[PDB]
């Protein structure tokens, strides 16, 4: 059970410098006398790591209290500790640090390590109380008051203590690196005897891996477990605790960096170079030996002033559809198109987009869209796509090999089938030649399979082009009706009329910025242009490879794009 | 309402030269001081354009009649007009120019433009009667007599007049380019002042786009609308019209050409080069600066002599077909099948192919063909098709759900029926269970209709399996005999033994032809060779592949092949 301590009072932060510390082995591969460059999460060299006393005495009276604030966990943590009396015992990791979300607990008593992954209900001041036995005093008994309750445990790990026994200036510097990558929580560690150095030593020590835990949970924050030798019920005036918190710990945050590591002959990392520290370090990394572009501030979106709405409902929720031949083709323009109602309705069995991802339809802006609507069987649904063959793909409706747009189809057994058969839809089994893309031949001329002419009379070897479509509600899936619409998008160098439901933002000028005019996205700086765009000009390309000038859709003004790249 | 005019009398055509006119802006981008190559519908340079007088005086008496023929619209039209007093007012476009098809009307009156898309009833001589007011004469009132009825309009457009007021040798040149691409009617226009030039002037003026109307109607035909100042009721001797039609309009037709356009520093197209005009233009286009294989005539295909034929005559033309229990399953292999015989002969009532189309039988090659020949009543020959039931589909012939092959039946009254009845064809009505694939059960065991055994002896609830069919020449069509053959084709991963007949053509020597010698395809010229091929070695080869000589399959002469000169 947990015990309530005093308020932390929000101590002001304190920093210190990390002189090239926190370099661990990125791989488990033996390398000898070689310089290897690795891009991974490392503690930056000469960085400001935040340092906290284990026990801090700040009150005028002389109050002693734990300094165990909840610290963030941004892409790993380098945790260093200089101590001599084992008053640091472990950590807890999690997002909310309560029963709602999973949490990790690592604690080291005198015998072994306890690593658990459970829905701990942690208290405000988690910690471990240490009491020595009356006769031995060789080991020290610990009562845990970290969590009130634990539930849904999915991991248990026990091994040799990460932290050895420290049982008078023989302080020890213990450095650890904790990482969370791909659901794995990795512990690297190294322990070194220190002497007469209050802050982090100057020097280089490699951190060998200790363990790779399959935790598979999310971490945002972490805290430190401290050992109390005094009593919370009766706080002594002084010396009840451990020398007013001489022992303390440093915390630094790992960042994505490229390090050049020098494995010596025996395979130990004896030196490292941080590529982003100084120009000399950059030179070392580029030469692989020991001996700039302006970023955009914000994103602006700029679209035309259109308030119309589309008849997409009418096209997709129509009572009747055309036959496979003589397919109905409607033009949709001058309206704002919401494709989320379409993509996320889950009422369509088939939804394939070519030349554009279906989740980005809501973002792009098109000159026009064309909706083709008809009904087919199931085994022929596969025929509506570019590059395919078949009686529909060759005689009825051909999509071009360069088709850009989305084909949508959904089941229509209970709309288009009738018990005795719905023969209101037909197809052509015969034609003199295959179709051209989007060419729709509706001629009913009698076929002439033989050598004799039919003269418009169907006898022998003379057949009428169109055969009926058999729709019955008892038919198999392959023989069932499917209502299909092909939306062909036109993305041309023309002012767009069918838009996405995106909100135009303010125009920020003479500044490097991400811009989006009429669906054209890019990065650069904009300036007033005196270019003589005639009333009909929309775009501009003096070099024919970079859009130097554009017309703003809202206000018809010529703004020329210089790359903010310098 | 319309007014009938006199006969056009089919004036002989007259031509003139177009000195680098009709160049427009292909794409809507700003280009400055750059040479861009564009492939599009352009009027070729130095082309012959047909020129028509607005008013032609050609009769001996001095008749004044308009020259407004209905001219073709072939992939765009360059319409230039040199005039002084606004006699040309607009155009009509359409396929039939009547109520059967939609039509486009563009008219420029004194105030604005009228663009309509309706199925007008255009008369033979559409025109605008133009009259001035009695006091002002600043503007001209126009009476439209170009259509009889307007109905079902699908478009309306009004804007500033295409033709400015021209209200005395300051002739003006107005150039338009009309294109009809992707349901879009695009109009390009430019207006220039011309001085003392009767025909199209020498120079360069670029046409700026005007309108991009979205219109689905196809055009392929058009006419020019003109204005009468004179009176049709009373034609004056002379000068009642406008000076006997000095003004005129020129029509040329666009063609797919590649142009090199030079955008100057201000962005206007200053010069253009027609890459297909002269060799130096070709060089200019190749260097993108302003400062050859012989085609094959026809295709030749030669395959060896057709020798082996299927015994289809032994199947279809056979004297006697077996009963409906012992089908004459006959194997067909190692010979060439001509299915055009049984197809084009069309002496067979039913000819149904499943899994294969009936016209491409001659092109496919099959491992084996199985022919089953027998005699069956009318209705039951209708029954044979996959997936169906009935006494025959369940008790005599077993036909799989997926069946690649053709069922072929013809009437056999004059062959299988006798006056006294042909009882030599026997049919079953009773079996213990339905059949399994291709089981030719000929068992004569007496079936037990009741609960007592028959022991091979008829009696009560004991019946012979085989009843007789009363084939007589007076029977109705349903009860008449039909000779039927089902041909099952085997297409599996094995070499084919039944193949269609290969159609070879004649031989053309000493000419650049496309050739196909026993599957070896190519293009080249063929000459008699004195080479010494062995009995084998159908096609010779040179030092590095690239077959130099071949042997004709039908005639053993060796024809050497020379690449077509390039």
């Amino acid at each position, epitope marked *: 059970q947990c015990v309530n301590l005093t308020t932390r009072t929000q101590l002001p932060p304190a920093y210190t410098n990390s002189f090239t510390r926190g370099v661990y082995y990125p791989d488990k591969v033996f390398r000898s006398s070689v310089l290897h460059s690795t891009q991974d999460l490392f503690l930056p060299f000469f960085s400001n790591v935040t340092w906290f006393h284990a026990i801090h005495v700040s009150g005028t009276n002389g109050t002693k209290r734990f300094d165990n604030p909840v610290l963030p966990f941004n892409d790993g943590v380098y945790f260093a500790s200089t101590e001599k009396s084992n008053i640091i015992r472990g950590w807890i990791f999690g997002t909310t640090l309560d029963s709602k979300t999973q949490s990790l607990l690592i604690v080291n008593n005198a015998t072994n390590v306890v690593i658990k992954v459970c829905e701990f209900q942690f208290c405000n001041d988690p910690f471990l109380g240490v009491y020595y036995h009356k006769n031995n005093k060789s080991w020290m008994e610990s009562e845990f008051r970290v969590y009130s309750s634990a539930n849904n445990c999915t991991f248990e790990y026990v091994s040799q203590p990460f932290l050895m026994d420290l049982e008078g200036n023989f302080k020890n510097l213990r450095e650890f690196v904790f990482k969370n990558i791909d659901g794995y929580f990795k512990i690297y560690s190294k322990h070194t005897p220190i002497n007469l150095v209050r802050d982090l030593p100057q020097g280089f020590s490699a951190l060998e891996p200790l363990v790779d835990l399959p935790i598979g949970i999310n971490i945002t924050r972490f805290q430190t477990l401290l050992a109390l030798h005094r009593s919370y019920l009766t706080p002594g005036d002084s010396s009840s605790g451990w020398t007013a918190g001489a022992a303390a710990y440093y915390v630094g945050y790992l960042q994505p960096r490229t390090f050049l590591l020098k494995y010596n002959e025996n395979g130990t990392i004896t030196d490292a170079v941080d590529c982003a520290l100084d120009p000399l370090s950059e030179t070392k990394c580029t030469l692989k030996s020991f001996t700039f572009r302006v970023q955009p501030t914000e994103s602006i979106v700029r679209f035309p002033n259109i308030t119309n709405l589309c008849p997409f409902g009418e096209v997709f929720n129509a009572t009747r559809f055309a036959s496979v031949y003589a397919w109905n083709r409607k033009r949709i323009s001058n309206c704002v198109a919401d494709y989320s109602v379409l993509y996320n309705s889950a009422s369509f069995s088939t939804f394939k987009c070519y030349g554009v991802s279906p989740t980005k339809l809501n973002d792009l802006c098109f000159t026009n869209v064309y909706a083709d609507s008809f009904v087919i069987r199931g085994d022929e649904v596969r025929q509506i796509a570019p590059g395919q063959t078949g009686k529909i793909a060759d005689y009825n409706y051909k999509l071009p090999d360069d088709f850009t747009g989305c084909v949508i189809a959904w089941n229509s057994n209970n709309l288009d089938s009738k018990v005795g058969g719905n023969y*209101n839809y037909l197809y052509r089994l015969f034609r003199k030649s295959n179709l051209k893309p989007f060419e729709r031949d*509706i*001629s*009913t001329e009698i076929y002439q399979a033989g050598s004799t002419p039919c003269n*418009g009379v169907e006898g022998f070897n003379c057949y*009428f082009p*169109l055969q009926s479509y058999g729709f019955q509600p008892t038919n198999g899936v392959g023989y069932q009706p499917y209502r299909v619409v092909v939306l062909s998008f036109e993305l041309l160098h023309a002012p767009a009329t069918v838009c996405g439901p995106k909100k135009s933002t303010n125009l920020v000028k003479n500044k490097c910025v991400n811009f989006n005019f009429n669906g054209l996205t890019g990065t650069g700086v904009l300036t007033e242009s005196n270019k003589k765009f005639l009333p009909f000009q929309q775009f501009g390309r003096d070099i024919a490879d970079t859009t130097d000038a554009v017309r703003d859709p809202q206000t018809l003004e010529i703004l020329d794009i210089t790359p903010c790249s310098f | 309402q319309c007014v009938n005019l006199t006969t056009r009398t089919q004036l002989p055509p007259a031509y003139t030269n177009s000195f680098t006119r009709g160049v427009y802006y292909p794409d809507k981008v700003f280009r400055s001081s750059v040479l861009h190559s564009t492939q599009d519908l352009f009027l070729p340079f130095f082309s012959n354009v047909t020129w028509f007088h607005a008013i032609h005086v050609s009769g001996t008496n001095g008749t004044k009649r308009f020259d407004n023929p209905v001219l073709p619209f072939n992939d765009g039209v360059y319409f230039a007009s040199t005039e002084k007093s606004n006699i040309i007012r607009g155009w009509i476009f359409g396929t039939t120019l009547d109520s059967k098809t939609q039509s486009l009307l563009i008219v420029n009156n004194a105030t604005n433009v009228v663009i309509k898309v309706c199925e007008f009833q255009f008369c033979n001589d559409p025109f605008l009667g133009v009259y001035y007011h009695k006091n002002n004469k600043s503007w001209m009132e126009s009476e439209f007599r170009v259509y009889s009825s307007a109905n*079902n309009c699908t478009f309306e457009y009004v804007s500033q007049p295409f033709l400015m007021d021209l209200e005395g040798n300051f002739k003006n040149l107005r150039e338009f380019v009309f294109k009809n691409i992707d349901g879009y009617f695009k109009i390009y226009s430019k207006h220039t002042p011309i001085n003392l030039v009767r025909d199209l002037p020498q120079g360069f003026s670029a046409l700026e786009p005007l309108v991009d109307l979205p219109i689905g109607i196809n055009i392929t035909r058009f006419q020019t609308l003109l204005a009468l100042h004179r009176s049709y009721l009373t034609p004056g001797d002379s000068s009642s019209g406008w000076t006997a039609g000095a003004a005129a309009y020129y029509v040329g037709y666009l063609q797919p050409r590649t142009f090199l356009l030079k955008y100057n520093e201000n962005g206007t197209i200053t010069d253009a080069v027609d890459c297909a005009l002269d060799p130096l233009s070709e060089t200019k286009c190749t260097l993108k600066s302003f400062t050859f294989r012989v085609q094959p005539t026809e295709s030749i295909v030669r395959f060896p002599n057709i020798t082996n034929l299927c015994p289809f005559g032994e199947v279809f033309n056979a004297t006697r077909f077996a009963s409906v229990y012992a089908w004459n399953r006959k194997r067909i292999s190692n010979c060439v099948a001509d299915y055009s015989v049984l197809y084009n002969s069309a002496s067979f009532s039913t000819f149904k192919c499943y899994g294969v189309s009936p016209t491409k039988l001659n092109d496919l090659c099959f491992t084996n063909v199985y022919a089953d020949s027998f005699v069956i009543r009318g209705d039951e020959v209708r029954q044979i098709a996959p997936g169906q039931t009935g006494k025959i589909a369940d008790y005599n012939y077993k036909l799989p759900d997926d069946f690649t092959g053709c069922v072929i039946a013809w009437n056999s009254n004059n062959l299988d029926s006798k006056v006294g009845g042909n009882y030599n064809y026997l049919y079953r009505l009773f079996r213990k269970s339905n059949l399994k694939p291709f089981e030719r059960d000929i068992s004569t065991e007496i079936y037990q209709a009741g609960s007592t055994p028959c022991n091979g002896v008829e009696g009560f609830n004991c019946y012979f399996p085989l009843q007789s069919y009363g084939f007589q020449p007076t029977n109705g069509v349903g009860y008449q005999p039909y000779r039927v053959v089902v041909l099952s084709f085997e297409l599996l991963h094995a070499p084919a033994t039944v193949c269609g007949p290969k159609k070879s053509t004649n031989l053309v020597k000493n000419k650049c032809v496309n050739f196909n010698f026993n599957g070896l395809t190519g293009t080249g010229v063929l000459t008699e060779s004195n080479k010494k091929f062995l009995p084998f070695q159908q096609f010779g080869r040179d030092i590095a592949d690239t077959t130099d000589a071949v042997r004709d399959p039908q005639t053993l002469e060796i024809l050497d092949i020379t690449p077509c000169s390039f």
Partner: nanobody
Amino acid sequence: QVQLQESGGGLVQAGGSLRLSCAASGSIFSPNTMGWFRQALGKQREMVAVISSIASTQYANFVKGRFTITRDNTKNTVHLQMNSLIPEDTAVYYCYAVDKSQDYWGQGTQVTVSS
């Protein structure tokens, strides 16, 4: 919403004649193609004839030489003059409008001939 008005069927003895008519009251963009289709109870749709407004005939062999089709351009109507009837020919008929956008159908005309 193109509507096809059909009228002129009924009960007639063997050897009689009837006069059907289908009228398209809808949009009918640009050329059409007016057709007549047959359906007897238990069978599929059999098109009698799909004559276009311009040309192309398209007569079937079922009733060869017996029915005829008249086109009225003023109202763009079609009439089926059906003579020399037989009980086999009897079925329910539907007029067919190809149109420029989509194809429509009628509501039906019962034709019965027997003795």
